[PDB]
Amino acid sequence: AKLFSVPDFVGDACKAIASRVRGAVASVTFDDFHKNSARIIRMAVFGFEM
């Protein structure tokens, strides 16, 4: 039943990832955001070191 906890899980996932991606790209120049585009966006989503 915890599956149906959030009733709009699609929107929740999209908004959370969009927010964190935008916040992390906010700290880098356009040159950096295009050199390591996928790299920084993928570390933006789940930023950690493992």
Partner 1 sequence: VVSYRVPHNAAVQVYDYRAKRARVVFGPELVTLDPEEQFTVLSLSAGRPKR
Positions that interact with partner 1 (CB under 8 A): 1, 4-7
Of the candidates 23, 3, 26, the residue with the CA atom closest to the CA atom of residue 15: 23
Do the beta carbons of residue 28 and residue 39 sit within 8 Å?
no
Cβ-based nearer residue to partner 1, 6 or 45:
6
Cβ-based nearer residue to partner 1, 2 or 50:
2
Cβ-based nearer residue to partner 1, 2 or 29:
2
**With breaks defined as C to next N over 2.5 Å, after which residues does the chain break?**
none
CB of 5 to partner 1, least distance (A): 6
